[PDB]
From a paper:
Humans produce five antibody isotypes (IgA, [name], IgE, IgG, and IgM) as part of the adaptive immune response, each with different effector functions. [name] is the least well‐understood in terms of both its structure and function. Secreted [name] has been shown to recognize food proteins and respiratory bacteria and to bind and activate basophils in a manner that is proinflammatory but does not induce degranulation. Like the other human antibody isotypes, human [name] exists in both membrane‐bound (as part of the B‐cell receptor) and secreted forms.
We solved the crystal structure of human [name]‐Fc, with two molecules in the asymmetric unit, at 3.0 Å resolution. In the structure, molecule one comprises Chains A and B and molecule two comprises Chains C and D. [name]‐Fc is a homodimer and while the overall domain architecture resembles that for IgG‐ and IgA‐Fc, and the Cε3‐4 and Cμ3‐4 regions of IgE and IgM, respectively, there are substantial differences in the disposition of the domains that will be discussed in more detail below. The position of the Cδ2 domain relative to the Cδ3 domain is similar in each chain, and in each [name]‐Fc molecule, the Cδ2 domains contact one another, and the BC and DE loops and junction with the lower hinge form an interface that buries a surface area of ~255 Å2. The Cδ2 domain contains a high‐mannose oligosaccharide moiety covalently attached to Asn354 in the DE loop that was modeled in each chain as follows: Chains A and C, GlcNAc2Man4; Chain B, GlcNAc2Man7; and Chain D, GlcNAc2Man6. Although the Cδ3 domain dimer displays two‐fold symmetry, the relative orientation of the domains is markedly different to those in the other isotypes. When the CH3 and CH4 domain dimers are superposed on one of the domains, the second domain in [name] is rotated by ~35° relative to the second domain in the dimers. The buried surface area for the IgM Cμ4 interface is substantially lower at ~730 Å2 but that for the [name] Cδ3 interface is the lowest at ~640 Å2. One of the most notable differences at the Cδ3/Cδ3 interface is the absence of a stacking interaction between aromatic residues at the symmetry axis of the dimer. In [name], the interface between the Cδ2 domain/Cδ2–Cδ3 domain linker and the Cδ3 domain is significantly larger at 922 Å2. Trp370 (Cδ2 domain EF loop) adopts a different rotamer in [name] compared with other isotypes, creating two pockets on each face of the aromatic ring that are almost reminiscent of a two‐pronged pocket.
Residue numbers in the entry:
A (entry chain A): 294 to 411, 418 to 454, 459 to 474, 478 to 501
B (entry chain B): 291 to 411, 417 to 454, 461 to 472, 480 to 500
């Protein structure tokens, strides 16, 4: 019998902020994915549209990968919609994965952006959220920036907190925006500070 | 007859903490697959078999039908520091020998120098700057006295050479240790 590893990837900040869309990616890794198929369910219904099945991929090591993508309007995401991918293979019982707003999940209360030194160093902080899985993005006049150093989420508390430092070269004035998406508590924070 | 299986071999290189705290360089080599009974991971140090220090691992079995087995080879830091060529090989009967090499690559620029200072100042914030190296594969570690502190924000390298930087947040002597694998180079700084 073949092993099958199926994963469900939640949408990234870039899709949710720059494109007003939430793209869920569900892919199975296997030895022979011919008759293994991925089905979708948005809030318990088969999707009307927005599903774009990927192509089967042979791999050098003998494994095979096939993926399927589902795109939701960001409104459905912030509302807490449930997305359920299913892996159906005739040799195995069905394997469902789910990305849903968790009742036990705390939204990130506050996001704080200020400056720390002068090349300028911009500090973005977000606190009061759980689970600790966090996604952060930096932007420079609606254009994405990557020169950042992100500190993963660290702990009296029920929550976690994280921060990322962005260093921008000393040069035109600019406004920097820090966007954070907590996925299990479908929040999308965003802040602007200017220099 | 018989049909072959998916077999994926991987090789981990020593970590900063391993070299800086223990003076030992452990190379973890493992293979992921379906039926790993006839899969034997073998080592070569400097191009010859190691006399000792190899810990073959039990066959891990995962909840998705995959099997995994890891063999690790621990070397003195001096051996790593010298540039000793480490090699892992997967020997399955119906498959070719698959070798993953952890060499000191000749074309690998080594980190020029390491910088450590204070970025800002309730808590305070440090910096660590590693400059002029390639490939960008690099590992960092902060230490409060002889104790590791994990409250850093690391910025991986972006583009002749590369440079990365890490900001540590502190609530002592703070040392930043840098490990560059391809040029078996290790650098530390210190501050107070
Ligand atoms: C069924 O499920 C099982 C369970 O997961 C699946 O098994 C997994 O299979 C995948 C196969 O792709 C493996 O991924 C590879 O992993 C290696 C290394 O893995 C290390 O890191 C993992 C993640 O660690 C982080 O997360 C964990 C949380 O789980 C956390 O605890 C940890 O602290 C850390 O934060 C570890 O999980 C893993 O530990 C496991 O294995 C240990 C050894 O066996 C064992 O001691 C542990 O107890 C544990 O069991 C391990 O520490 C990745 O390196 C590798 O990615 C390389 O390869 C891909 C190609 O696929 C490439 O795209 C990447 O860029 C990367 O390439 C590097 O390596 C190449 C050499 O192989 C080199 O040529 C490249 O240049 C690059 O090298 C760079 O870095 C290295 C540094 O070592 C340096 O040498 C180079 O110079 C250069 O700098 C894969 O991602 C999983 O590890 C494996 N999981 C387990 C638990 O075994 C199975 O696949 C599923 N089956 C199916 C059908 O789906
Ligand atoms: C033969 O070689 C192939 C190719 O290298 C191997 O295929 C790889 O298999 C591994 C095994 O799991 C896959 O790792 C998984 O990756 C998940 C996300 O991957 C994303 O990032 C990677 C790297 O950045 C990208 O390459 C991927 O993009 C590829 O796939 C998309 C979709 O098809 C394509 O569009 C792209 O072009 C690429 O082709 C992805 O973007 C990762 O989340 C996952 O980690 C979860 O699972 C492990 C268990 O293995 C947990 O330890 C871990 O904590 C995570 O678990 C949490 O998260 C998941 C959701 O992510 C939840 O479901 C869990 O419940 C839990 O919350 C895992 O690491 C790898 O993606 C895949 N590579 C490719 C290119 O397909 C074969 O394995 C190999 N065969 C053998 C036998 O060795
Ligand atoms: C980010 O968008 C939110 C909507 O939730 C809004 O309240 C806030 O003013 C925006 N941030 C900035 C800096 O404009
Ligand atoms: C790193 O630490 C060792 C031992 O503490 C010391 O000998 C060495 O001089 C340090 N590195 C530098 C660049 O001074």
């Amino acid at each position: 019998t073949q092993p099958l590893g199926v994963y469900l990837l939640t949408p990234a900040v870039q899709d949710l902020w720059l494109r007003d869309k939430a793209t869920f990616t569900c892919f199975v890794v296997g030895s022979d994915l011919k008759d293994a198929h991925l089905t979708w369910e948005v809030a318990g219904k088969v999707p009307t549209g927005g599903v774009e099945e990927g192509l089967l991929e042979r791999h050098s090591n003998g494994s095979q990968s096939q993926h399927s993508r589902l795109t939701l309007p960001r409104s459905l995401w912030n509302a807490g919609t449930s997305v359920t991918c299913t892996l159906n293979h005739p040799s195995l019982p069905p394997q469902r994965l789910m990305a849903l707003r968790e009742p036990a999940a705390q939204a990130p209360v506050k996001l704080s952006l200020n400056l720390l030194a002068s090349a300028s160093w911009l500090l973005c902080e977000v606190s009061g959220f759980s689970p600790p899985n966090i996604l952060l993005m930096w932007l420079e006049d609606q254009r994405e920036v990557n020169t950042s150093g992100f500190a993963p989420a660290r702990p009296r508390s029920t929550t976690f907190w994280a921060w990322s430092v962005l260093r921008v070269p000393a040069p035109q004035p600019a406004t920097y925006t820090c966007v954070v998406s907590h996925e299990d508590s479908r929040t999308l924070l965003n802040a602007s500070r200017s220099l």
